[PDB]
Prior knowledge:
This is part of a larger assembly, with four copies of chain A.
Chain A: H1 16-26
Amino acid sequence: KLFETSPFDPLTIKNNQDVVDKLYATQSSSIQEVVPTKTFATELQFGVTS
Amino acid sequence: YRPRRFKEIEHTHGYVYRELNQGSLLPLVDANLKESSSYYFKKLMSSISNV
Amino acid sequence: ACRDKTSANWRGYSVLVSRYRSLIPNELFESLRNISGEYNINPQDEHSFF
Amino acid sequence: ELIKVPTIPHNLVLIQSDNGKHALIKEDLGQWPVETGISLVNQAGVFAVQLANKLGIDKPFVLDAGSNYFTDTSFIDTRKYCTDGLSPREIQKALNRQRAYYDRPELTISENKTLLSQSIIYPDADGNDVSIIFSGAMSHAIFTYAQSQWNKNIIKLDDYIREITLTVPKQYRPRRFKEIEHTHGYVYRELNQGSLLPLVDANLKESSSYYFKKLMSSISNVPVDARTLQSATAALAADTGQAVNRAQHVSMLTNRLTTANAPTVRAITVLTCMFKQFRIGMTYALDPNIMDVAAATCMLLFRPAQSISDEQYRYCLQTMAVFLTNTTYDIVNNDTIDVLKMKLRNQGWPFVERYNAVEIDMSVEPLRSPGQVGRYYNPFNIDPLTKKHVEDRLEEFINQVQVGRFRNASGNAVGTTLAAFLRACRDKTSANWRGYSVLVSRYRSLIPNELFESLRNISGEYNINPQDEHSFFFALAQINADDEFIGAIDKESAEYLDEYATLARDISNSLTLVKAAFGPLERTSGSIINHANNLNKVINHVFADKPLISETMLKILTIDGTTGKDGYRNWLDKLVGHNYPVYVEPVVNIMNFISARFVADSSYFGYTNEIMIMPNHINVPVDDRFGFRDSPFCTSLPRTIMGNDVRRISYNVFSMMEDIDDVISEGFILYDAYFNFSYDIMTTDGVTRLKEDILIVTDTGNDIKPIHFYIYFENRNDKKLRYESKMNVSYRLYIKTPACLLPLSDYMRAQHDYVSPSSSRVYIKDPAVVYTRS
């Protein structure tokens, strides 16, 4: 078996964002290069609204 | 190494079906495996029993 | 302590790497030579491993 | 303890037919199953150990067969007839039966006297007894070789005393010996010294920790006589100006004088003065004070220069400069030794120099160091000749410190306090150096020169706190040697001797194992796999049943924290491909001899290297000396038969074959294998045939079944047996004639001589040449 847990099921997805979301859900099984944690932001701007 | 002998009847009147297509692994191999390499890595480490 | 432990238990890890290399086929290994990555390891994990 | 063997281990067996026409003599050494595809020398050694066990040869021994004799009734015959070996009466009876078959007259009186006097014991020139008896060739050769190898280590008592005369200490009482033990004393002692340097070099810190722990556990219990701490504190307080109302530096010095850890510092001092290089360091407080200066000065002045390292010297100088020279640690971090010395000397502080200790040579030779002279450092940097410190300006330096100004432009508080403390310490050391010198000498007599030059303190376990150092030098105790301490020390000396010998033996065994088992390593994988598997097999085998390695070696390897198997495995791996010399002990030579004779003379042990198979209708030259009917023995395998060469086939090719019928229709010589066989010589007459079939054919391959010959003797005029042999048996198997088989007619070749040493020799179990004092 190539994968102990499949990266994603090809039949379930319908667009590209579905692929992106599925990888984030199944990345726990994968041997991650950098494990996910709380993200740190360095730039943040708010534009005026209506 | 040489193969063992079958029965005499299977030698005089024996017929076997076979296929000669070895095949190739290129269709599976040829791809951008950047995203899918780590799952294969985990399966590879799970293949060999440790501890 | 780290030097003694590494000098005592290097043959086993070398043999393990040899077996893991023996598992992979040639075509897949040639394919995997195109990709590249970097692994981030926490200092505590490294010091515990050694 | 030598073992006196009372009887020669002959293995001759006389086999004679019921008719009595034929007789033969056989050597019984047993059948040993030998495998193929594996090396033969290893199996030869494995079998040689058991063969030596069978003959009573493996353990050290001497022969005591001289007294096994009797004398004849006739008054002329003064000869001593030996009772060992094949008795001449048996050969006489067999020959009489053989002559009874042929209708010849029985042996005459003169012939009987000639035969019955063949085995005899006669004296030799130097007093040994030579016994000539009927015995086999293999037993004779192996027994004689083992006798020589073990005799190589038996030496007269006077020679041994001469060899060990250099190492006897002066104080112990000489041991009187009985005059017999001087004229006829003999001792069995191995005199080769096995170097302990392999273990010490391979794992330095484990050995250092083990020896240091044992030595300090010994030293810590030395009785001492010490002045009261309160009395010394009162003396120092009176010397300076000490008052309870006002805070002072002398109060800081005298507020933390602890004698609790005095024995540990005493043991550390002995260790420093004992070994060639034993480093000790102190970690001072982050903010230095007068205690730190006192301790640093004490280390520099009274500890040996060899004990202090350059980094420790720099750290001590830095702390002193921080305290006394209005500076911080960050100022002098980049400063070197010379700058620190100049800075401290400019302010007037002269104690900025290390001082080399003065060596004293031991009166007697160090143990396990043949042809060498040992030395140890004198404690507290005091010259034994001058009976004072190495620095001859110490009083002037103390006066300089007294008159100097440190930490304050006006007022001599620090200078006076430090001068008083240093003067007190100097007086204590000058008074008490002698006992510490004696203790250092004695405890140096326990370690050899390899340990003296090799052992180092690298774990840093044995450090001294600054408070402990200044307290130890202020309230130095007088070392007192009691009788109980000396007796305990003698007991430990015996223990160390035994442990050193066991370590040497274990090292030699490990070197032999690592040379015989593991070969070179390579950068290729599969070689690493093979090495790992072989290492695991070796470790598992050596640790099973009785462990090969002694318990003390397991302790010293384990002291790090390993399981005992892991430490030995690591040490064995580290020893692969060494160049350390090793000594060939007598037992190794005996095993090598027996293994070589096992490889060469294969017929004695029930296996051959070529056999032949041919049909019954082809005549074959056979060894007809014995008289067997259809004898399966040939003097040598026929090179050519019926004018054509005999085909030779390897066992592998023969097994791989599929047309065995055509090649068996002519017969062939199988080789390239070790064919194990056995035979049962039956006294009666009958058909000579194998227990099992010659050959077995399987679809996988062809094999040769086990060979067990049923040998019967021959009566020529027997039509039934002749017809059965001619017609019933269709194929025959021929092997080379065993060398253990020997006809009765040529029995004189069984005569062999064994020499036994004189019975006047007396053996000393305890060759010690001296007695304990009390």
